[PDB]
Ligand binder design. Sequence first.
Ligand SMILES: COc1ccc(/C=C2\S/C(=N\c3cccc(O)c3)NC2=O)cc1O
Length: 328
Amino acid sequence: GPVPSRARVYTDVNTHRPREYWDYESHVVEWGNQDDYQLVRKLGRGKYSEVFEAINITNNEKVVVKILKPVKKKKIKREIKILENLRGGPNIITLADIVKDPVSRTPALVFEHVNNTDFKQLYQTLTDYDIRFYMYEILKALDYCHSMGIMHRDVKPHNVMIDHEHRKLRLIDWGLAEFYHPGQEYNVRVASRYFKGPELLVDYQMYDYSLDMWSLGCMLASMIFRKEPFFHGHDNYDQLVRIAKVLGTEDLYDYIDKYNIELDPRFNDILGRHSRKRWERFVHSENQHLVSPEALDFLDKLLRYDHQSRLTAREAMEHPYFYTVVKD
Ligand SMILES: COc1ccc(/C=C2\S/C(=N\c3cccc(O)c3)NC2=O)cc1O
């Protein structure tokens, strides 16, 4: 069988927390008053929810309301429990309330409002200094949630809300987040395709917080190299092939051999043989202002096949790439 794996940090956080902390199936929701909130405009829709701008009429403050579509109550309680556990943490979106929507007959989560710019437009604009600053702010959120025993499992640009005017950042959309427990096998159908870690793409279920660090590396690569998304696969199989054309096939085989993993035989006709590339090949005159030796070294240490070899969020915050960021 496959070789087991443990997180190298925050391994036992939930072990020594009280059961109530991570036992979300037993959580009892504290419902607020649904008539406190007036919906203003729809902001988005997905398979599992719709999101709205709204006004809290008890204080005339803007909020954001996510009205769930029907989904297992276990997963609704999981997201609620995680948001309450993380509330107040650095750059974590604040859950302000939970109400029952009378039309949907489902829960509606009420969040603080961020005056956001779309990443497609914001990313055409950020400077080298901006990218370092906001990467540091994301790391604060990720080290916090990892230190609290939670993996996000859907890190991607669409889930990082930035109010550039106030240099304010919030990590949102905790609907896929999970509690880390040593030895637990997790669903690999998480994260967006372009941000899926190799562990998901080879069906290794005993993964951990380090998944979020791969996803963050994909974001960093897209920003400093001006290629969004960086690994642009047409499906989950091609996604691994795109990664292997950069990291090389020999280290992919080292990875699956370490964990006694077997590749899907459908890769026999599509994977090929690929050397590992040097990151300098992705530098050109239109992105070199965003690239430095420090950026390439930092990126290189996030994008490792072996989830046990990636920088932790705390280690990443120690990296020389962040030396120029003003610390508060
Ligand atoms: C404009 O400011 C904000 C925007 C979003 C949030 C929080 C969200 S949105 C989400 N999930 C989605 C995303 C897209 C479509 C959809 O139907 C559901 N999960 C969250 O926590 C908070 C804000 O302050």
